[PDB]
Ligand binder design. Structure first.
Ligand SMILES: *C/C=C(C)/C=C/C=C(C)/C=C/C1=C(C)CCCC1(C)C
Length: 133
């Protein structure tokens, strides 16, 4: 389904360290971040998304409209400028972040009662699975 609305709690996180390292997230931050639990809150109305990711210490918050390119500064993450675009490929939501890093972005989709998130950067892929809270 294309409906990704809800509050989603992480149950699995594969190669998170590899992905953070590919983004050059500093080693000391990685140590704190790597095994934190995550809650992902998605508000979706038509093309309009509001996405909030939360953990004990960190948050990543972003609003976008499907099909509308937006320039991003990746602030507390890796401090880079990218050109972001989120679109649908079937029922997979696909984000491409054009910039220095190759293959940078994510894909998000629903299967059953679960949300799947694939984060990509360089040659690294991180796969996360969430259950609806
Ligand atoms: C569509 C879902 C998206 C775009 C989720 C993005 C989530 C992040 C970029 C996660 C960031 C982090 C945390 C939530 C805490 C652990 C360390 C970070 C900064 C990598």
């Amino acid at each position: 389904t294309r409906d990704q609305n809800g509050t989603w709690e992480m149950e699995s996180n594969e190669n998170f360290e590899g992905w953070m390292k590919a983004l050059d997230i500093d080693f000391a931050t990685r140590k704190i971040a790597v095994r934190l639990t995550q809650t992902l809150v998605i508000d979706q109305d038509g093309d309009n998304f509001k996405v909030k990711t939360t953990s004990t210490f960190y948050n990543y918050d972003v609003d976008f409209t499907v099909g509308v390119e937006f320039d991003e500064y990746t602030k507390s993450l890796d401090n880079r400028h990218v050109k972001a675009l989120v679109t649908w490929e079937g029922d997979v939501l696909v984000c491409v972040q054009k910039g220095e890093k190759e293959n940078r972005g994510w894909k998000k989709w629903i299967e059953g009662d679960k949300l799947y998130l694939e984060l990509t950067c360089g040659d690294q892929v991180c796969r996360q699975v969430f259950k609806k809270k």
